[PDB]
Design a protein around this ligand. Structure first.
Ligand SMILES: [Mg+2]
Ligand SMILES: [Mg+2]
Ligand SMILES: [Mg+2]
Ligand SMILES: [Mg+2]
Ligand SMILES: [Mg+2]
Ligand SMILES: [Mg+2]
Ligand SMILES: [Mg+2]
Ligand SMILES: [Mg+2]
Ligand SMILES: [Mg+2]
Ligand SMILES: [Mg+2]
Ligand SMILES: [Mg+2]
Ligand SMILES: [Mg+2]
Ligand SMILES: [Mg+2]
Ligand SMILES: [Mg+2]
Ligand SMILES: [Mg+2]
Ligand SMILES: [Mg+2]
Ligand SMILES: [Mg+2]
Ligand SMILES: [Mg+2]
Ligand SMILES: [Mg+2]
Ligand SMILES: [Mg+2]
Ligand SMILES: [Mg+2]
Ligand SMILES: [Mg+2]
Ligand SMILES: [Mg+2]
Ligand SMILES: [Mg+2]
Lengths: 123, 144, 187, 258
RNA sequence: CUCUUAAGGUAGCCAAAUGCCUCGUCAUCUAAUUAGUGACGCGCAUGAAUGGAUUAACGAGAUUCCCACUGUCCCUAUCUA
RNA sequence: UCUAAGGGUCGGGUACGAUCAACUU
RNA sequence: AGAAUUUGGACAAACUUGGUCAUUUAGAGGAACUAAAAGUCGUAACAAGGUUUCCGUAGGUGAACCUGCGGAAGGAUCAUU
RNA sequence: ACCCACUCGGCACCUUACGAGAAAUCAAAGUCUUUGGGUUCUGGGGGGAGUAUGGUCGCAAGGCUGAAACUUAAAGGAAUUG
RNA sequence: GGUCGGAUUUCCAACGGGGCCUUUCCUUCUGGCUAACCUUGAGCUUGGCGAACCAGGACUUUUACUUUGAAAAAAUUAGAGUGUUCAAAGCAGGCGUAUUGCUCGAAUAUAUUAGCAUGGAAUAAUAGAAUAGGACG
RNA sequence: UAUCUGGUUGAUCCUGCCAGUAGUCAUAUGCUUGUCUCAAAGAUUAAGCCAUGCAUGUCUAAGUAUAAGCAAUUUAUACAGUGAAACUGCGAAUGGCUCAUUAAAUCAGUUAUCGUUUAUUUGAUAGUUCCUUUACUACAUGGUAUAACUGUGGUAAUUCUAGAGCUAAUACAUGCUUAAAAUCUCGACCCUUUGGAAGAGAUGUAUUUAUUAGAUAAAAAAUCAAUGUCUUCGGACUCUUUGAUGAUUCAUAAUAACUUUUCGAAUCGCAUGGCCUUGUGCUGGCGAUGGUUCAUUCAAAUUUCUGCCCUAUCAACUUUCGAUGGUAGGAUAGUGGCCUACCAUGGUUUCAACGGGUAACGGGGAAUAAGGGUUCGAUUCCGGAGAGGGAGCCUGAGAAACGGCUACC
């Protein structure tokens, strides 16, 4: 008798185990961003997938829907806040087509790299 | 109705605490108590001017109508002062997005103030448990 | 023991329900009093939530009321003469509700002389003043007057001796008396 | 089962207490008292979780056993004494007085009243009935029985209790156009100026209510608490005055100052 | 394949009241069974109105087992006309 | 030692009463 | 006031004997199915498969199968003003 | 009784493919991923198997209803070239 | 843009609501407010027809459907806010001259059917006056 | 993230299944395992069996202490400080565990109690009880036993106990002390017509029975039965008291009695203040505990409507002796075939009754999903059931209670 501790998984494995295209693009991302696993790429795909799940449900609603106005602005605000969403694209329609590695651009090691201080992404 | 030959049981059938004093004489030799069941239902003239006792009557008895008010079609009048109604309804199965016909047989008590035949439509008012299966009392007859 | 529940005997369709909920105390019953006449003996029953109940046995007397005259008296009980439920309760002189019994009819007889004063069956001026005012109302009935000659009255037990411990009733009058007399005189 | 329960698990306590689900297996079960278990503050939640005047349930017992806290002018040493709507809490220290009113979000809000406003309280009459020896009495929403009321007092009205003696000072009749306070339901904590009510013989009355901003809503009669004539009420309303702003308008107000 | 018949015993059934060998072989029934029942069939010498195979009901018909019962018995004793 | 059910014949201006008698359950 | 004891009743565990249902399980013998193995016998079907094939029904025969009656073309004929 | 024109109903027939189909073919087997006129019945890999068993009908032959254990990676349809 | 990317009005429009007339009662009495008052007193005055708000009324065709609303515990699901260093989490927290203290939160949504109130009245049913006890009277 | 691929052929297009593929708050197992946070965990088979040790006890200022206990208060010769034991009052019916039973049963949402019980809490609420009620009487307060304790003991053993001797209550069992006033009955006498009286009794609450009131849309007259408050006996006549519900024989009041009779303080702590004819005189505070009735809260019991998996190789089922309904009664806290006597032949079913199965506790929920669905839910919350299988029962407000008792297996 005590309130259970809520937990959830944060990654999704791809449906097909072996395809040349995905096994290349994902490894290109890991090598160019210095990531240890493929799970660190599945995590971003999972996180982006939930983002486009909510943005599709909002867009299919009527314009000036009180729920869409509150949730659409809040969703854009978070992506604008962390730099994934640019300031010029705040229509809730550029959310659906952002990218996979737009999130990887804002991670600590990439940004630590960008302001010098590493002179290599692995450093 | 047939007035059910009122004094027919082994005990003297009378309304409790309704005393008709024989020392004094006046009109309406037999005092009759009655009431309105409420909720807009009227008291039929048979209940007011009858001679039946029917302690389960909602107008001249000790039971009160409260709770649910239902409507059904009479399918059996073979008991004594109790009938069976059939309440049809449509049950929605969400998988197929459509309905199916269903029914329930409700045994309800009918007062001698009313006359009910098979096929008639009546409204029954909820009362306290009268018998093992009876929970409703006829309050208005809508067909003849 | 005796249970009042309903998960026993079959439903309306005739199906026999399975066993469920070993007998509970809040659905119990007990054994009938089967009250007799004479040598009063009443036992105490402890019911739910305290609430003492009285299981009368062998009751001697009772408080019977004359509805027309609006008086009540304590009178002895002679015996049971009719019972609408079972004829054996008549034969065994069992005291239950709605049972027709005889009563001594003496307290009712003595009160009538004090109140009305004329007679039943067959001194100071403060008395007949009341008697004169209490006149034109000593003509009760011919079916009750004749009983005072025999010294017994047809009463009806309106009380529950096995529940309250009391045997209280009323004297049969008017239509009710005429109904039960036909039952008793039939042969 | 076999008798009354005595423990109240967390995740089963009323949600308006704002008890964190972790940090404890149980919740304070309110004792028998003037108010329902579902709608009850009791002081341990009020003293510790609301006022932060205690760190544990042991310090709450220390405060109460010294006769500091009092409800309706009486000490009420019980740690889980149920304190409900319109109850007045007086603390001798800090010279503070409180009245239990619902926030616009449906929660009991900490409301500080003056000394004079702690000298009375309002109670919604629940039944007007004759007692023994033909003595009429009124039963308020907090279980208070007051003998010999005004003959014009009928059910659903609000009376004013002196809280020094149980006597009634003045009463507000339940008529159209009176300021009301919604107690219970989805519209809990709103103030709305009755426009009309529907009869519905049989039960479950309905009343139509529209607040100052002309937002109309309907609630059951038993959830309505008249608190005076339209405009000035008979008690000090909490901040917000029961407006029920939308979530879109609420965030702009929160964004107004930062 | 061969000799042969008028035709070479078909369907069925069987150690059956019909099988010598025989107390046939296997199973069951029993502590133990030349008894009984169920199977098998190169059947000395079963078999189709010489009627074959079945068959509910019926039988002072033959046989086996089981329950009840008991002087049939262990093992005799006593009483009456 | 009791209880109950199972009948005949007479009776209304143009529902009830009286009387008698069966062994069957 | 009151113990042991005692009458009748109700509730009624439990035991015995049967009955009924269900689930497992032995069984001489009988008769199928499946699979394997270069087993013995023939060649029934696929070509007009060398008697066109197939269906229902009945009988017969080592075995596939054969034959009678009616039917179909999935025929080997879309065809004789 | 024939001839010409029209018409309603019937047995079919010829051409084409708007369309359909895996194809053979089809004026319905069309108006079916642009998926909905109403309704009844039946099927869910091949064997075991229309078998066992239990019912029910029949004088009988048999009819109707109708499994499971087990076994298998294909059986099967229409056309193509030999 | 009459303020410096935020809203007011007299506007050409569109889209959704309400009332009235065109044969169109789409129920009402005892009485209050008499109300919107022919009420007008000199340009703000003494007096119109009751639901626009009410207590009780004979009566009162029945459903299906759809909209809105109250109910559908908490946790969980979706979801807003927020430094658990991130995250899963949790319901925290934040700001001061930090000497005295001040203060935002702990939302919102979904939650079949059944039951309840509600507006609509297309669609689908049901009933009415025919050897007239048919309605107004 | 609304996706498919390999396998029948010499080759082809299909039907079709087999195989692959991804996930699983679905388990188990294998190999391997450096860090922080978080975390299920004898459910599946066996609701099979259990050594051992714990899991229910409890005190204040305010029930009872001569501990032949501890210490000194020193304000104390009755006690008044702390405090073992025991009597008393409460609690032990909560919690925790498990999922065997259970298929309109449980349960979910939704209703009712105008059909009932409710310790505790909160708010109100007994002037009426000297019973021949003028010596019957203690009302500055009335009795008994017993534990703890001393000592004699019995059994191998148990939370076993006996005989003897003490002593307390908020233990048990008795019991009075307070105003009036009004009303209803009896009723002396003058003696009368218009008749009033001295005096006496009754009149709280609780129980039981019977009866009465508990009314109410609108306005005026006729003479009587007799005047009815006061008469200028012409009659002015009004005040005539009447709550709630949709609904009541309701709340409530009244009359007549009944009860073997409930309750109506013989209780405790602290503070000690006022008045005099200064007597242990009369008054006087804040609390605690308890108590009748109602309300309230914590609940309980029953109950309305709709809704549950697979099965016809389950189609008819229920009614001997209860099935469906009526009348009456008994029982119950209450309603009710809950049970009994008499009576009627009723009730459910292809819209699937009834029977069988479930490797079935039901929901809130879980996994996977474009949409639609499929599968699972012993298990952190809600409701139910059980303590090895049955049944029965004491205490209590509440148990068919098992860390309570009784009997059988
Ligand atoms: Mg429990
Ligand atoms: Mg508590
Ligand atoms: Mg060969
Ligand atoms: Mg060959
Ligand atoms: Mg051929
Ligand atoms: Mg074929
Ligand atoms: Mg022609
Ligand atoms: Mg033709
Ligand atoms: Mg398949
Ligand atoms: Mg198949
Ligand atoms: Mg082919
Ligand atoms: Mg093939
Ligand atoms: Mg090949
Ligand atoms: Mg597969
Ligand atoms: Mg299990
Ligand atoms: Mg109390
Ligand atoms: Mg009854
Ligand atoms: Mg009955
Ligand atoms: Mg189970
Ligand atoms: Mg639980
Ligand atoms: Mg139990
Ligand atoms: Mg066990
Ligand atoms: Mg037990
Ligand atoms: Mg245990």
């Amino acid at each position: 008798p005590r309130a259970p501790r809520t937990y959830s998984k944060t990654y999704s494995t791809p449906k097909r185990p072996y395809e040349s295209s995905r096994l290349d693009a994902e490894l290109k991302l890991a090598g160019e961003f210095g990531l240890k696993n493929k799970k660190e790429i599945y995590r971003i795909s999972f996180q982006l997938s939930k983002i486009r799940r909510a943005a599709r449900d909002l867009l299919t609603r009527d314009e000036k829907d009180p729920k869409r106005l509150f949730e659409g602005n809040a969703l854009i605000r978070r992506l604008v806040r962390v730099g994934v969403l640019s300031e010029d694209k705040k229509k809730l329609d550029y959310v659906l087509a952002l990218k996979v590695e737009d999130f990887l651009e804002r991670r600590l090691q990439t940004q630590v790299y960008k302001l010098g201080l590493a002179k290599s992404v692995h450093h | 109705s047939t007035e059910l030959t009122v004094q027919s049981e082994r005990a003297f059938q009378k309304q409790p605490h309704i005393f008709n004093n024989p020392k004094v004489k006046t009109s309406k030799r037999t005092k009759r108590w009655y009431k309105n069941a409420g909720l807009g239902f009227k008291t039929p003239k048979t209940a007011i001017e009858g001679s039946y006792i029917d302690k389960k009557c909602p107008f001249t008895g000790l039971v009160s109508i409260r709770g649910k008010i239902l409507t059904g079609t009479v399918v059996s009048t073979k008991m004594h002062r109790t009938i069976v109604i059939r309440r049809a309804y449509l049950h929605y199965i969400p998988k197929y997005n459509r309905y199916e016909k269903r029914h329930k047989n409700v045994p309800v008590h009918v007062s001698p103030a009313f006359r009910v035949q098979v096929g008639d439509i009546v409204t029954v008012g909820q009362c306290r448990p009268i018998s093992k299966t009876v929970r409703f009392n006829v309050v208005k007859v809508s067909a003849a | 023991g005796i249970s009042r529940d309903s998960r026993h005997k079959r439903s309306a369709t005739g199906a026999k329900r399975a066993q469920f909920r070993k007998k509970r105390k809040f659905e119990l019953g007990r054994q009938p009093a089967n009250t007799k006449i004479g040598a009063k003996r009443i036992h105490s029953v402890r019911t739910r939530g305290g609430n003492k109940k009285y299981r009368a046995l062998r009751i001697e007397t009772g408080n019977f009321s004359w509805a027309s005259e609006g008086i009540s008296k304590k009178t002895r009980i002679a015996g049971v003469v009719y019972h609408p439920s079972n004829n054996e309760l008549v034969r065994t002189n069992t005291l239950t509700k709605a049972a027709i019994v005889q009563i001594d009819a003496t307290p009712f007889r003595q009160w009538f002389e004090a109140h009305y004063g004329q007679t039943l069956g067959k001194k100071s001026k403060n008395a007949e003043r009341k008697w004169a005012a209490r006149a034109a109302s000593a003509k009760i009935e011919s079916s009750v007057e004749s009983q005072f000659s025999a010294g017994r009255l047809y009463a009806c037990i309106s009380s529950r001796p096995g529940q309250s411990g009391r045997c209280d009733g009323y004297i049969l009058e008017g239509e009710e008396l005429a109904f039960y007399l036909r039952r008793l005189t039939a042969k | 089962a076999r008798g009354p329960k005595k423990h109240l698990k967390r995740l089963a306590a009323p949600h308006h207490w704002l008890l964190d689900k972790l940090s404890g297996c149980y919740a304070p079960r309110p004792s028998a008292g003037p108010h329902k278990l579902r709608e009850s503050l009791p002081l341990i939640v009020f003293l510790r979780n609301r006022l932060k005047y205690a760190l544990n349930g042991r310090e709450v017992k220390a405060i109460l056993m010294q006769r500091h806290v009092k409800v309706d002018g009486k000490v009420r040493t019980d740690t889980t004494y149920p304190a409900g709507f319109m109850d007045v809490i007086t603390l001798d220290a800090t010279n503070e007085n409180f009245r239990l009113v619902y926030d616009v979000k449906g929660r009991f809000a900490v409301h500080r009243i003056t000394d004079e406003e702690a000298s009375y309280k309002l109670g919604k009459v629940k039944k007007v009935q004759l007692g023994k020896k033909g003595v009429p009495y009124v039963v308020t929403h907090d279980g208070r029985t007051i003998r010999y009321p005004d003959p014009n007092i009928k059910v659903n009205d609000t009376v004013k209790i002196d809280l020094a003696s149980g006597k009634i000072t003045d009463f507000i009749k339940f008529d159209a156009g009176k300021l009301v306070y919604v107690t219970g339901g989805r519209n809990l904590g709103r103030i709305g100026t009755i426009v009309h009510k529907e009869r519905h013989d049989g039960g479950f009355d309905l009343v139509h209510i529209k607040d100052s901003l002309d937002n109309t809503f309907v609630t059951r009669l038993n959830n309505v608490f008249v608190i005076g004539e339209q405009g000035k009420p008979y008690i000090s309303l909490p901040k917000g005055k029961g407006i029920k702003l939308s979530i879109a308008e609420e965030r702009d107000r929160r964004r107004a100052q930062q």
